[PDB]
Structures are given as structure tokens and as C-alpha cells.
Symmetry: C7
Subunit: 242 residues, 7 copies
């Protein structure tokens, strides 16, 4: 009718630990304020994800304890401002250039497939049928759907990190380089006779720079990834001693 | 009034096995990370689909047992970084080129029509009328709608595999070839006198390559196909012995 | 007060058979896999439609039996890979060219108007008023709305068949013809001196062909037409003998 | 307090017949299959509308009977395939050219204003107040809202007929004429020396014709106008004799 | 506690008549059928609006009677077809040109502000508090919201009339004039030698005319403005004599 | 436990009067009918806003009375038609040019910040805890949310007034000036030899004028701003004398 | 079973003060009315945010008191108008140029990460299980979600301040400068012979200025940030003395 050894094996398989989430620290792509705020937002989202994964591990431990109690119920168990322009270019180029975001996103994208790879422990029972088996299968299905949702959130956070890295690659491609602004400053200093000639160029260098930094403060504002807390396991009390 | 032989034949027809899902393994189109993650996502979705089809087979077995109990209730039964550019081109071309995705998708598209072809076993009864016949017809209709939804998910997974294959065909058409980058490197090495001439070409080769790989990391991120678990069959208990 | 002969005539008019659905078999437009899957999907949708129309005929028979019982309650009743390109063109042209889809869709579009033409049998009663007449009129109205929904699904299936036929007409207009590819192969074989001249043309023939077949695998994926099962007729038991 | 003569006059005004719906028969604009299916769809929608207007007349008769019972409660009452191209042009031009659709739509658009012109019979009472007067005013308001909805459906059916007529006017403006195709056939037959000259013209005549007929099979597919059945009148039983 | 003179003054202010709706009759802009149907639709909508405003006046009279009963409860109160083309132009120009629609819409737009200007009579009471005062304030608020909705419908009807007037101004600007068609007919009659020259012009005059009249039959189809019936006033019965 | 002096101070702070709404009268921008209707709509919306602010002041007075009763519960308290064209231009220019709308909108935009500046009186209590304190805090929070919604409506009305002013600035920029039409009339009168020359100019002056006035009658139709009535304060009855 | 020292430590950690919100005052970017209204709106939103953060601090104090009562339950605790144009330019340039908005937004963006950095105090308990522990964990989770929502609102207010600063940078880039208008006025005054030459330039200077100020009055209208009041802490009464 009911095989208790399957229940004990399923409890010891549910209680078994999953893989650890990655511990990569996403450093900022440059020294701009929007990039540092995006990197700190990714750090806080990763810490939130690890905290809720530990809470889900505790919920799986409580579910394994409830499965052991359900097994024990049956039987007996054992004028040109060149300074601001070249400062903006210098701040935009003095960083990791998104080489730590593409290593953060690869880890949190591999962890998505790692979390999807071991949802086999929440399968339904084979030889256990009854009214408690349906509730335990419902609890295991709730834990499985929560783990799949957490893997989806991990993939979304990896996509956010890749989006910030691609945005910094675009913002360093589009912005005028530091050495060109330094050369234009020496061209302005050496010969004032062309002050009516290179000043429309510099003004263009201003406007394009204002296009870049405005796009950086608008697009590198990440929304946080707050995960749902894990659903509570079923509480099956131990049977009273007769 | 009620013909029990029709009930026994319908139970033995519901319990009969359907066709097996295909066991093709979708290999990666190239050695990029997005293509390997897409291939692993397709492998995990296929494993999820096969697991839920086995669970549906067990639910059909329980429904056949309930139909046998309903039959037994009546009567007595028996400065140029050429290295990174040519590495990206080499990684993009060292693969199966989507020849295993188009064989995965053909199998999971034929399995869609195979699952739709044998929903005749969930038809309503002919000579059995009453109050248990309506509940058994409702259970058979629930199993039929679940099998049609599973066939729709199989067609969606085949469309995902075909989309990744078409994306890799586009990404190998658009990206600059490996031999052209190798020839441009020798053209850069043999004569530095044209270093102010072929460098705008190489820069274009950079930008187009950045257009391809950014499109590969954005478009080859598949969402998982999680199927619904099969609906529980009706439980008709055997009649008590008088 | 209540005329039983109207009830008997309405029961014998509801039980009268409607027109048969058409039995045309939609053959594939060509030998491509997407066209064969679309034709098999249309065959399965037509079989599903005919099965549910037979189930609705049985439900109308039960409703006529209930109307006869309601009448009996009152009184006493009686390097160029030319092979793959010319194989794709050959496979695209070796078919019925959508001449059997335009004969499938015409039949299932005439059956739409045929099903809408004979919903006069579900009209409300004239001389029968009371509390059972309202329930019988509600059952006849449910059957009428179900038959109108089935006619709408027949028109939708005919539109799907016409869409696949128009897609194949476009895909044979846009794809390069077989004889042109065969002539280009002989032009490539006879004189290699123009190998740097006709190869950009052939490459264009490749790309346009990839535009066609990708559009065929994406647009000729039909969704199935699963009809709702007919609503259950009211069950009016025969009166007990006094 | 309560004037029964107002109740009798309102019952005899509600029971008074409205204007008859028009009996124009929408003939097909041409001999194409889509135009004949659109004309048959308009015929079936007009028959459905007339049937539900007769049902609403019976419901108004029952409401007048209930108003008479409410009055009686108070006091005592008393290689070129030219054949298919010129066949398509001939079939497209051998019709009524939408001269019967513009006479169908004018009648069913005047009937919209005719149905809106005589909703004055469902006004609230003047000298009758109480608890039955509120229910009778609610029933008259339900009948008024149903008649206004039926007038809106009549205007929608007239708009469908005008849309099919405008579509046929466009499809005869855009398609190449029959006499031009007949002249091009004689130009092809008399001098084969220009077979490499007029054949790109004829091919254009093919493609434009395929643009027209595809637009005719897609746009002349009308959805049916199924009206709601009229809401049931309040049933006020006659008072018992003391 | 309760001042009955405020209740009597509020009843005599609620019963006071508002401004009359305007009695302008919207004549047709031209002799086309769509313009005459639009003008008749505006006439029917104005008659519906005046009928429901009279019904709301009767409801305000009943509310004033209920306020007087609530006051009395406390204390003791005291080959060219030129004929059809020039007929269409003649019919399009033989009208009032929308000079009566712009006088209809101005009246029904001033009546919107007139109805919004005197909702001060539905203000809440000052010295009357209790359990009947809350219900009387709820009834006055319901009447105020209904009057504001009726003013919104008056503004919508004025916008419909202005839309028909602007449509006729456009349709007389775009259509070819009558005198130009009459001059082209004399140019066709006097010299047949230019019959291959002015006939493409006349054909253009046909097509543009078909663009105008099709736009007139499609855009001048107004939907009716059916107002909601006024909400029933609270019925407070007079107190019984002790 | 409960400090009654805080309750008395909070009641005397809630009863304290806020700032008065501004009493600027928005005059019409010109003598057109749409501008006069927009100005009258703004006058009616401002009167509605002032009426509901007075009603909210009475509700705050009742809430202060309830807070005093809650304090007293604890302890013992103490052929060219130049005439119509130049008439339209004259009517369009004979006004205040939107100089009174930009002074209306500035007042009703400063009143938005004035209403948001003094919602500090609806703060929660400090030393008062219990079951009546929660209901009084809920009533104060309801009054605070209503005052913030009224400030939002004041900002919306100021935006409507600024929109009408900007529309009149555009409509006087785009319309042809009065002096130019007067000069064109004298140019038409002095020399008829150019009657085939300046008449296409005048026709353009017609069409552009029709573009302006149509845009004025369509865009200067304001919707009314009806505010919600203030939510009723909690009624705490005075305690009975022991 | 239950460790009371963990409860006392968690109460003293919840009651511990968080970081103070920043006290930067956003000054106006210029002397325009829209910029001053936007700066006053940011001041009022910051004051609202600080008030609700103080209210949340009081709610955390009440939650710590409830945790101390839950711990005490177990054991015993211890004709050119140049004047208006140059006035608009002067008013647009006489300000802080958005240098105080970019210091307001940096503070309120760092406070977002500061509020997200210390939500570790609302973690679930380790050694405390039971029926009161679940309610206390639910209250701590409600406070955590409210603090995360308040951090999201702080980031939204910082984005509003950065948007007003970028809008003023654009509006000073696009508007014509003060010195150019002053030079054009002297060019108009010194030589009237070019009055037909520089007047189309000045008119352009008018129109572009009207484009700027209209964009300033439309885009610098901020909506207020009203935060939700903090959710009420659970009230666990102290145990009665036995």
C-alpha cells in the first residue's frame, strides 16, 4: 500500500543541497555616477537573491522534516570649457570597461540552467497514494514552481548586467575620445587665428558629449530584482505515542 | 441500459501507450556562449516535456483503473586587436551550423501531429449513460485538453529551435568571415604605408562584428517551456463485497 | 393551454439531420516540411470538427427525446552548393500548388452558410408556455449558439486554408525558379573565367532563397482548431404511471 | 391614485405594430466565390434579423398582456496561360456591380432611423406609481434598450453591405480589364517576334491580378450578425376572483 | 437641531425649472442620402434628449415632494456618363452647406454650460443632519451626476453636428465642381478630335468623385445618442396623523 | 496613556482655515465662439472647485468637532467673399490674446503648491493610541488624500488654461492677418487685370483660414473638471453624563 | 525551543536608527515660473518623504516594543518687441543652471542604495518557531517591502530632479542667447536701411523662443511623489501577571 522507504529516500533527496549561487562581484564599468549606481544595484540584487535562496533551503529542510513525519506516521522509523569635457571623457574611460559585468552575467546565466537542471527532486511519488500524498505533492510542486521562478529571475539579472555592459560599450564608442580632446585643446592654444574655425567643431564635441551622458543617466538606471519569499512547507506533526 | 464490455474496452484503449517523444539531442550551432546556453535550454525543455508526458501516462493508467472499477460496480468482472576579432569569427564558425536544431525541430513538430492524431481514445461513451458516465467523460475531456495543450507546447519548442537556427544562419551571414580577417591581418603586416587606409575598413569590421554578437546575446536567450502537470484522474473506489 | 402536437412536431424537427460536413482532403501545396505539416494540421482539424458535429447530433437526439418526454407528461402519446539550392527549388515546385486547399476552403466556407441557414429549428415555442417551456427554450438557445460558434470555427478553418494557399503562391513567386538555377549551373560549369562575375549573383540567389524558406517555416505553422464539446441537453424524465 | 385608462392605452400602444423590416435581396456583385459567399452571408444575416424582430414583436405582445393584467388588478375591465487570366477578369465583370448592395444598405440604414423613431411607446408612466409600476417601467426600458441595440445592428449590417460594394468597386478598378487581356492575346498570337517584349507586361498583368483576387478572398469574408434574443417580458398573473 | 425652513426652501429650489433645451432643427447639408440620414439622426437624438430632460424634471418634482414630506415629518407645515457625374455634383451642392448644423451645435454647446451652471441646487444641507438627510443628499447627488452626464451628452451631440458640417465642407472642397463638369461636357461635345485627350481627365474626375461619395457614405453615419433615464427619487411617505 | 491636550491642539489645528483659492476671472482670448465657450468652461470649473473647497472646510469643521468629542470622552474639557475672411480675422484678433489665461493658470498653479504645503495638519497622533485613535487617523488620512487630489485637479485646470492660451497663440500665428486681407482687397479692387493672378493667392488665404478655425473649434473644447465631494468625517458622539 | 535572547537582540536591532535622509535644498535652475514651480514641487516631495520616513521610524519602534512583549511572554525579562524677447532670455539665464538639482539627485540616489543596504534587520528568525513567530515575520516582511518601496520612490524623485536639470540644459542650449539679442537690437537701431533684412531673422528668433518656453511650461510640470504611509506593526499585548 504505502512504502515508507520511498518516503525516507525522497525526504533525504529533498534535503540534499543544491549548487551554490555564484559569488562574482560586479565592478563598475567606468567612474560615472550612473555606472557606479548600476553596479551597486547589481550587487544588492545578487545579495537579495542569495538571501532568498538560503531561505528556500531552510524551507526545503522543513519540507524534508514533514516528509519524515509523514513516513513516521505509518511505521516505526529509526570661453571653451575644455576641462569639463576632458573630465567627462577621462571619467568615462577610467574603468574596467564592462569586463566584470560579462563575467557576472555568465555566472548568473549558468546558474539559471543549474537551477533548472535539478528540479527532479520535486517529482511526484510512485508507490505513495492517499490524502497526505496529494498535499505533499502539492507542496513539492509549489517548491518546484518557486525554484523555476527564481531561475527566471537569475536570467533576468544576467540580462540586466549584459545590458549595462552593452550600454557602456556604446557610450564609449559614441563619446569623443580623451586624446582627441587633448589634441584639440593644444590646437586651440597654439594658434588663436583659427578660433573662428575649430570652435564649431568643439561645440559639436560638446553636443555629442551631452547626447552620451544624458543617455547614460537615463538608460543605466536599473530597477531592483526583488524575489518572492519561498512558499511555506506543509507542517505535518509527528504522531502521538499510543 | 449499461454495457460493461464497452467500459472494459474503453479502459483498455485509454491504458494503451501512445507514441514515444523523440530523443534527438540539440547540439550547439557554434561555440559562442549564447548558442551553448540556447542548446542547453532546449535540452532541459525536452527533458521537462518527456517527464510530464510520463506523468500523463501514469495519470491515464489511473483513469483506466477507475474505469475498470466503474465497470466492476455494475457486474462481476474477471593597435588593431585582430586577435579578438578573428577569435570571435573562429568561435562563430566552429560548429554544427544549426544542422542538429533543424533535426530536433522536425522531430518535435512531427510529434505535435502525432499527439493530435490519437486523441480518439478520449471520446465520449455510446451506450453508457448515468451520473458516473458524465464524470468519466469530464475526466477524459480534461485529459484530451491537456494532451492538446502538450502538443501545442511541443510545436512552440520546435519553433524556438527553428528560431535559434535561423538566428545563427543570419549571424554567420552578417559577421565578417575568418579568412577575410586573416587576409586583412596580412595586408596590415606586409605594408605599414597603408596603415591610414585599411584601418577605417578594419574599424568597420569591428563595428559590424559588435552588431552581430550583441544581436546574438540578445536574441538567443530562450525562455523555458514549463508544461502544466497532468490533471488528476477521477478516483472511483471499488464496490464493497455484499 | 398546451398543444402537444406542436411539441411532437418540434421534437421531430430538432431530431431531423442537418447537412453533412464536406469530405475534401487537403493535399500539401509542395514537398516542403512546413507545407506537409500545415496540410496534416488541416486534416486533423477537419476530423476534429466532424467528430464534434457528430457529438452535437447525438446531443440534439437527446434533446428531442427530452421534448418527447415533456410532451408525454401532458397527454398520452402514441564552392557554390548548387545541389542544395536546386533541391530547395525542386521541393518547392513539385506539388499541387494549392489547388486542393482552395477546394477545401470553398467547401468549409459553404458549410458555414449551410450551418447558419438551418438554425430555424431552435426557435422558441408558440403555444407552449410554462416552467418547462422556458428550460426547453434555454436548451434550444444553447444548441443554437453552439451551432453558430461551430459555423464560425468552420469559417476560421477555411481562412487558415486560404492563408496557406496564398503563402505558397507568394513563396513560389519570390523564390528563384528551378530552370534559372539549372541555367546558372551550366553557366558556372562552361566558363570559369566569369567565376568572379556570376558568383555575386548566385550569392544573391542564396540569400533570397533563405528569405523564402525562413518565411515558409515561420508563417505556415498553423494553430489547431479545437472546438468546444456540445452543451448537454436538458434531461426530462418520463412521468410515472399512475 | 392609479388611472387604469392610462394603463389600457399604454398596453394598446405597446401592442401596436412597428414598421416592417425591408425585404430587399442582396444579389452578388460578380461571379467570384468570395462575392457569392458575402451575398449569402448578408441574406442569412437579414433573415436572422427578421426572425428576431418577430420574436421581439411576440415579447411586446406578452408585455401588453401583462400590462392589461396589471390594469385588471385594480378595477373591472371590459506558356502564357491567358485562359485563367481572362477567366478571372470575365468572372470579375459578369455581375450586378454592387447595384443591389447599395439598395440593400439604404433600406437597412433607413430602418435604423425608423426603429429609433418609435421608441416613444416605452416611456415611463405618468399617473401610475407603486411597486408594480417600477417593474413595468423596467420591462419597458429593457425592451427599449433591446430595440436600440437591434437598430445599431441594422446599421452595422448596412455598413457591411456598403463595405462589400466599395471593395468590389476597388477590385474592378484595380484588376486589368477583359478587353485589354483579349487584345494582348491577339498581340501575342499575331507576331511571335515580340515574345520577349510583351511577356514582361503579361507577367505584370499576372501579378496585379493575383494582388486583386487575394485581396478579394481576404476582405470579402464577412462575419455574421447574430442578434441577441429579446428579453422576456414580466409575467403578471391575473387576479383571482373573490 | 433641524431647521424646517431650510428644507422647504431647498424643496422649492429643487422644484424650480431649469433652462429649456434649444429647439433648432438641423437641416441637411445637401441632398445626398447620407447627409439626410445624418440630419434625421440628429433630429431624433435631440428629441430623445428633450424627452429625457422632461423625465428628469418630473423626477426633480418627485424629489421636491419627498423633501416636503421630510420637512412635514418634523413640524406642522402650512461612353462618358456625364449625367451621373453632374447629378452627383448637383446633389452635393444643392443644400444649406452646413449653415444649420453650426447653429444647432452652438445651441447645444451653450446648453452644456447652461446645464453645468445650475447644479448649485443639489448642494448638501447645512443645518439638517441625521439619517434621512444622508439619503436626501445621496438622492440630490445622484440627480446632480445625472445632469452632468446629460450635459456631457449634449456636448457630444454638438460635436457630432460639427463633425458632419466639417465633413460636408471637405466633401464640397474635394469633389469636382458642377460648372467644371458642364464645361468638360461641352468640350467633349464640340470637338471629338480630342476624345483621346480629355477622356483621361474625365476618368480622373470619375475616380476622385468616387473617392468623395464613398467617404461621405462611410463618415456621415452617426451613432445615436441614447441618454440614460433619470434615477428614481427617494420616496419618503408622509407621516401618519396621531 | 492618553494626553487630551494633544487632542485639543490637533482639533484646533485641523479646524484652522487654509489659504483661499484665487479669484481671477479668465476672460476670453478673442471673440470666437470656441474661445468664449472655453473661457466660460474655465469659469464654471473654478466655481465648482471653490464650492467643493468650501464643502471640504465644513467637513474639516465636523472632524474637529469629532476630535473634541473624543477628547471630552476621556476627561472634563472646558466672387471673392472678402467680408467673411476679414470678419474671421477681425474676430480672431479683437481680444485679450490670452493675457488673462496666463494669470489664471499662474494663480491656480501656485494654489496647487499652497494646498500641498499645508497637509501637515493631517499627521498621525503621537501620544494617543487606542481604537478611536486609529479611526481618527484614518479620517485624517482620507482628508489628506482628498486635499492632495484637489491640488492635482487644480494643476490640471491650470494646464487646461495654459493649453487654451498656447492654442490661441498658434491660431493667431497661423491665420492670415487682418491688414494683409485688407491690402489684398484693395489690390483686387484697384486693378481687375490681375484677377487671374491674385485669386489663387486669395484661395490659399481661404484654405489656410479654414485650417485655423477648424483647429480652433476642435481643440478649444475643454472637458469639465468635476471634483469629488469631500469624504464624510467620522461622527463620534459626546459621552453621556453619568 | 524558544531562545528569548535572540528575540531581545532582534528587537534592539529593529529599533536601531537607520541613516538620515539628505537635507539638500533644490534651488531653481532659472527665474522662469515653471522652473520655480518644479523646484518647489521637489522641496515638497522631499518634505513628504522625510515625514513618512519619520512615521516609519515610529512604526519600527512600535514593532520593537511588540517583539519585546513577545519575548516577555516566555520568560522574565529585566514694431519688434525686443524687450519681451531679451527679458525671456535674461530670465532664462539668471539662475543656478541646474547645479543644485544635480546635487539633490545625487544625494537622493545614494539614499536609495543606503535604504536598500540595511534591510538585513527584517530577516526571519532562526531559533524562534511557533504561531507568534510567523506573525512577527510577516510584520517584519511588510516593513521590509515598505522600505524597499520608499527607496524606489527616492530613486524616482532623483530621476525627476535629473530630468528637470537636463530640460534646463536643453532649454538654454536651444534658446537664443541674451548677447545675440542685444547685438541684434543695436543692429536694428543703428541702421534702419536693413529693416527689411534683419526682421525675418528676428521673427525666427521669436518663433524659436516660443518653441523653447512652450516646451518649458509643458515639460517642467512635475507630478508629486506621495508615499504610502507605513503599515501598522503587530500589537502584542504584555502578558498578565499570574
Amino acid at each position: 500500500t504505502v512504502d515508507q522507504q520511498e518516503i525516507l529516500n525522497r525526504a533525504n533527496e529533498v534535503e540534499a543541497p543544491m549548487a551554490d549561487p555564484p559569488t562574482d562581484v560586479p565592478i563598475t564599468p567606468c567612474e560615472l555616477t550612473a555606472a557606479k549606481n548600476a553596479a551597486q544595484q547589481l550587487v544588492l540584487s545578487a545579495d537579495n537573491m542569495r538571501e532568498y535562496l538560503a531561505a528556500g533551503a531552510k524551507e526545503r529542510q522543513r519540507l524534508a522534516t514533514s516528509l519524515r513525519n509523514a513516513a513516521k506516521a505509518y511505521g516505526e522509523v529509526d570661453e571653451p570649457n575644455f576641462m569639463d569635457l576632458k573630465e567627462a571623457a577621462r571619467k568615462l574611460e577610467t574603468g574596467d570597461q564592462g569586463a566584470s559585468l560579462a563575467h557576472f552575467a555568465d555566472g548568473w546565466n549558468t546558474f539559471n540552467l543549474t537551477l533548472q537542471g535539478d528540479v527532479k527532486r520535486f517529482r511526484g511519488f510512485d508507490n505513495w497514494e492517499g490524502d497526505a500524498a496529494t498535499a505533499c505533492e502539492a507542496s513539492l510542486d509549489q517548491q518546484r514552481q518557486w525554484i523555476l521562478h527564481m531561475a527566471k529571475l537569475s536570467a533576468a539579472m544576467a540580462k540586466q548586467a549584459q545590458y549595462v555592459a552593452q550600454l557602456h560599450v556604446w557610450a564609449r564608442r559614441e563619446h569623443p575620445t580623451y586624446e582627441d580632446i587633448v589634441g584639440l585643446e593644444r590646437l586651440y592654444a597654439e594658434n588663436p587665428s583659427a578660433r573662428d574655425q575649430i570652435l564649431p567643431v568643439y561645440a559639436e564635441y560638446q553636443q555629442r558629449s551631452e547626447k552620451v551622458l544624458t543617455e547614460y543617466n537615463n538608460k543605466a538606471a536599473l530597477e531592483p530584482v526583488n524575489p518572492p519569499k519561498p512558499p511555506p512547507a506543509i507542517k505535518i506533526d509527528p504522531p502521538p505515542p499510543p
